[PDB]
Each structure stands twice: as C-alpha cells, then as structure tokens.
Symmetry: D3
Subunit: 152 residues, 6 copies
C-alpha cells in the first residue's frame, strides 16, 4: 500500500525551494500531491506547476478551493503531510500547524525536511518584494515560472 504525501501551499510563486523539497519527497513517498490552494486563474498556476514538475512521474498537481488541509488529504487518501523548515521562525510556525492538524486528524502524520542552503533565506514574500522592484531572482524560480512572470 502506497505512502501518499500531500504537500500543501499557495505556490505564489513556486520557487526552486519548493521544487527541491518536491524532488526529495518524491524519493521518500510512493506519491506526492502538490495541493495548490486557490495574478493567475487556478488552471494557469496548475499549468506552471505541472510544467515545472513534469520529469517526476510520482508527482501530481491538484487545485484545491481553500479548506482544511487535513480534509483535503483524507479525501485523497494522503496519510502524510510533507513540509519544509527553513529557520527558527518557520519551525515554530510549522510546529503549531502540525499540532493543530494532529488534533484534527491524528492518523495523518506531518513529515519534515530541512531547506537546502541556497534556499534557506527564500520566502515568496521577499521574492515578491524583490520582483516588484525589478531585482533579478531568476536563480530562485524554475525557468517556466520566470518566463511566465514577465507579463507583469
């Protein structure tokens, strides 16, 4: 029986950090579902994220109208949530979310991987602020996502 992980996010944008963690968890799980919780209509973000993840066969992308993460995993048979931790702040934020999800769905297990060094300082909020003032963050974004994003 499959070990299935949901990797939830708003992926606004998907960064090479997300890709990195996705790549690594595809090795750890039978499958990984990227739940994009809904600049781009759902099926544009879906397009980009499938484009970006195309070379990984056990990885699928699903739009999810906003709801309880654990409800979305239950309805997909995902008994695992997979999250990254990049710093102390991230640790405590993720940890509160995991204790809450454990109360809500005790049979679902949150699993953590640490962010890799080139990406540990990268969050979409700082990315977006830098995108907004024109800075070159092209090293932090999958190329499809960078090219799609010039239409600003």
């Amino acid at each position: 029986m499959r070990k299935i992980a949901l990797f939830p996010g708003s992926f606004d944008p998907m960064t090479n950090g997300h890709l990195n963690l996705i790549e690594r968890s595809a090795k750890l799980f039978d499958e990984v579902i990227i739940g994009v919780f809904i600049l781009f209509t759902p099926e544009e973000k879906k397009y980009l994220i499938e484009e970006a993840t195309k070379e990984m066969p056990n990885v699928r992308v699903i739009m999810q109208e906003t709801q309880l993460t654990v409800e979305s995993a239950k309805s997909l048979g995902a008994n695992f949530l997979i999250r990254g931790i990049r710093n102390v702040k991230d640790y405590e934020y993720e940890k509160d979310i995991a204790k809450m999800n454990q109360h809500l769905a005790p049979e679902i297990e949150t699993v953590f991987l640490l962010a890799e060094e080139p990406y540990a300082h990268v969050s979409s909020s700082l990315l977006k602020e830098v995108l907004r003032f024109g800075g070159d963050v092209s090293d932090y974004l999958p190329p499809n996502i960078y090219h799609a994003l010039k239409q600003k």
Copy 2:
C-alpha cells in the same frame, strides 16, 4: 495587603489555555482581574468570560476601553501584570511588552507562567482559521463559549 494581578487580553475567543492561566493565577494572587480590552458586544464577552470563570471566587471580569495596560492596572490597584509564554516567538514579544511596561510604570511587575503543553500550540488566530473552515476545536474552548459560538 491584597496582591492584585491584571490579566490583560482580547479573549476573542477565550480558550482553555486562557482558563488554565487564570486558574493557576488565582492560586498565586489574592485577586485576578481579567481585563477585556474592547463578533460579540462588550456585554456579551463579559457574560461569557464570567460564566467560564465562575468557579473561581477571587477572579473578576472588568471590561476596559482600549488604553495603556499599565494605566488600566494603576486604576484598579493591580500592581502585577500576569501573562503566559507559549513559545520563543511569544517569549520575545511578551519580553518587549514587559520592558516597555516597565519604562511606563516601574512599580508594576510583569509575572509569567508557561503555557501547559496541551495549549502551547493554540493562538486565537489559528483557532479562528480552523473555526472558519469548520474544524472541531471544541476541546480548546470553554463549553459555554463553544456553544455561544456555534449559535452565531
């Protein structure tokens, strides 16, 4: 003489973690005043909080117009501020508030209790997020506050 503590807060909603701090507080001070700094009306929160804290003879609810916490404790003869710490983030935030409060009113002592480990992950903002999607957090709310909540 009486040692009186003010326990300031929003209590939006009051949680079982708030209640646990109040119960532990009530063994430490002669009186605890729950100061509700102002969903519901003033009169409503007042009743609800009173209802939840009714088993505790030395605890009372005094609704407060938004002002400096120290000005409010001064006006009640509360020479102690009582607060909870549940994590490092909360630790550094309460810390800054205590030092500001000490510069404002050096005769007033801030006292801290650590959250009990069942509630150490509970924030009013996370609890509200779960409630809005219909998750069951009834075990983190006073029964009467859980009812008044469903009811609205």
Copy 3:
C-alpha cells in the same frame, strides 16, 4: 528508492519519546533500523530495545561501534536517517548534523519528525539527573527498561 531508515542514538535509556518516534516512522518506511551506538553491556542494551520494540514487524535493532553515522547507514543499506526535533535547541543541533551528513553522503536523506507533547521536555540527560535523585520518571520509559533499571 526502496525505503529503509536508520534511527541512530545512544538509547541510554530509551524513552517513550524514542519509542513514539520509532512507531511513527515504522508507518512511513519499509524498514527502520534502530542503531544503538556504543549500566548495561551492549547486549543487555540490545535485548531491552528489542523487547520494547518487538510488536513492530518492520523494526530492527543493531549495535554499532562508534563511527560516522553515514558509513553505518551505508553498510545497512539505509538510504534515510530519521531524527526527532523537540525544541529550538534541538532543531539547530540536528540541522548542523544533517548538513554535515549530507556533505559526507549526499545520497542519504535526513528526515524529521517533531516530538509529541508529552515527551517534548524529555532528554536522556534530564532524565538521568532525575533517576539519580530517586525521582519517579516511570511514565517516560518503556516498562521493561524501567524494571531493568531498578535491578541495576
């Protein structure tokens, strides 16, 4: 991959926390090896762990001469290491170990689980302090390791 994990440790003593993390990880991996790195002889240590972990079919105990954890994982065919994080201190210390281990053996993934609430304050060092002053920490140790510790 196929999914075998080494859970390294000194297990002096093994706690209910260790046990908890073993149980959760036996659900994620095909096999999990408990690597006890070296007042019991190792053989006594090995028997006690096995005895505590016996109801778990995909769990194996192995004694290891003190060596590089990654080399030990390589011998056993473990392509994962599994670790617990109980607090910020533990987070930064595991993180340095995981980054080093990944410099040494980049094909091995370190995967993390958060300590659950009852055991988040429990370390073997605090536990040994209590044990040495006669404190009752029997709720924190598996029953056979507690009875065994009494006879010693």
Copy 4:
C-alpha cells in the same frame, strides 16, 4: 573597499537606538549615509534627522524614493550596508535580507551592530502604539524629534 556605508530604514520615528547605531557607525566608516526611504513629510523627515545627527561631520542624510537598497547603495557609491540586530526575530529577519542583498549585489557587504540594551526592546511598531495612547516615550526619542511629534 572604500569605507562608505548606507544605513537604510524608514525612521518614522527615528529613535535613540537608531542614533546610537549611527554614532557607533561613524567611528567605523569614513562616510555614513543615512538613507530615509519614503504626517511627517519627507522634506520634514530629512530636516529632523539632519538636525539629530548634526554633531557628526562624517554622516549625511539622503531621502530615497523606495527601490532596492542595493541599487540605492550602488548609486551612492556605498560598498557597506550597516544594520542593527536587537533580538532573535530581528536577527533571522536581517539575515534573510542580508543573504538576498548578497545575491543581488555580492560586492556590497552587510555589517551588523547589536542594539545597546536600553533600546533592545524598542521598535516603531511598539513605540507608535504607546505614543498614540499618550504614554511617555520621550526617553527613546531625540529631543528635536520628540518636540516635533507633539504638534500632531
């Protein structure tokens, strides 16, 4: 590198903690440029900081329309950014900004000074809260800035 530092921030208001970091900065660099990024008009803000820092011949003030800090530093010929760290939250936040700025302009160094401990708890967020309820925070503000805050 030339010893020319940019000290960026919004200085609304400028505090004694800002002034202290500027004072210690002026002992370290040949030139320190205070970069004000934009109730107090910018023409006013410039004047107050100029006034507050008049005693330091190697310090000057420039208002910057908001842009990437590395680009403002480039334009002014600064090869150093100086920042202050007042707590763990402030450290992890500045570290991210620093690592991003190094990605954008790896030839600019970020240099850090710790807050002097009388101002380690002071942030404009907190200060402004206290001011607006009329608490006396006069000790945290250069007199010129304070005397000008009153006529609002």
Copy 5:
C-alpha cells in the same frame, strides 16, 4: 495556595541579577526562601547571602543538600518555585525543568521573572571566566560578596 516560594540556586557567586529577582519576588510572596544547594564554606555562603538580602524581611536563606528541587520545596513547605529567564536558551532550559518538575510535583507552580536588562547577559559561568582573568565585574556582584571574593 499559601504564598511561599523557593528561589533555588548554587549562588556561586550570587549576582546582582539574583538580588534583583529576589527583590521583585519579595513584593509578591509572603515568604521567599533562598535555597542554597551545596570554595567558600557552606557556612560562608550562608553568611554572605544573608548579608546581601538583609534589607528584606520576608526573605530567608536555607542551605540544602543537593537533591530534587521539588523535594526540597515540599520539605520547606514552598508551594511555588521562582525562576528567572534572561534569553532564549535560558527560556528553553527552564521550560524543560519546569515541565519535569510539574510531572514530579504537580501541586507546585513554577513562576517566571524576566532578567532586568543590565543583568540579562550575566551568567555565573561568564562571570567566573572574567573573574579568573581579573576583569572588573564589581558592578555585577553585591559589594559584600565582591570584598569577600577579593580575599580568597
């Protein structure tokens, strides 16, 4: 509960940070016991700490053989434990001790004060290093403990 608190410690040396927390505690509790857990003589330590605290009438010093703190409290009739927190590492360490103590003796409450910022960086281990090298840390020690120290 009766407002009787144990402030435990090795007090080697006792600092002005320790005095500061004792002064603050003596405003809250009917009785504050300084539990000195046992090179000055035990007899010497007792006199030294007694002379430092003499200005406070609801304080008393008791030497104690090393043992579980909650057993010492229970013997002396203390219902509260008073500790100080000076930083994040101190916070996580005291938190673990408090939870363990809560397990051993749930009727005893641990109460926390935050170090006054002048003493936030002062730890006996740091202090002892400086003393060993002859640095002047007279500001950080009750003058009587300092005079006594110059002797030995």
Copy 6:
C-alpha cells in the same frame, strides 16, 4: 577611530569559515589581527595560519596567551573586535560576550559578520569529531591546514 580589528580565536583548526570572515573583514578595516589564543606548537599554528592568509597585505597573525580578549585588543592597539554569527545559538553566545566586553572596555566596538552559508553549519567541535572518524571535510579546511593535519 583607527580601523584596527582583532579577530580572536583558538583556530584549532582554522576553517574556510574563518578565512571567509578574515577576507571580508580585510575589506573593511585598515588592519586585521588574527589573535591566536593558546597537537601543534604555537609556532606551528602560527605558520599554518600565516600561510593560509598570506594573500592579504593588511592581515597579521599574533599568538597570545589566554586572557581577556579586550586587553589583548588594548595591548595590540585594536579598536574593534570582529566576530561572526552562524545561527541563533551563536548569536546569543556572542551577544553576551559583546555586552560583557562593552562593560570591560566601552571604547572597543564589537562588529559582526554573518557566516556565508556553505560554512554556516561548521564548528570546531563538529569538524574535529568528523576528522577523528576519518570523514572527508577537506572542503572545510585551508588546503595547507588539511595537509598538515593528515600528518599527525
């Protein structure tokens, strides 16, 4: 004040982390002293570190016997101490040192640089623990130091 900095350490071994901070500080100060506070004799250490830093005309290497860092600074004519911060543990530990040093020698300024992220997880204790089990941490040492080390 004169741009003369002491970079204090035991440099056992000096790592590429250290070398990175000396290279960046060599851009900021007129003179950087590597202060080596005392496997290798002092003069062996001296020649290894001089050889590792020889391409910087404004760097020099001075052995010191263990003593208060700030009087070492004062003896050598340094006005600044330069340190690196790699993580939260390290930030709290350096902060206390810097605050004590400021007490002892208020005219000496401590200045911080953040660890560059390939070495952010590298410490003396962890490097030596790996070296003693045979691991290849050659990317982490100046090549001359690593060679000299493989001969002992």
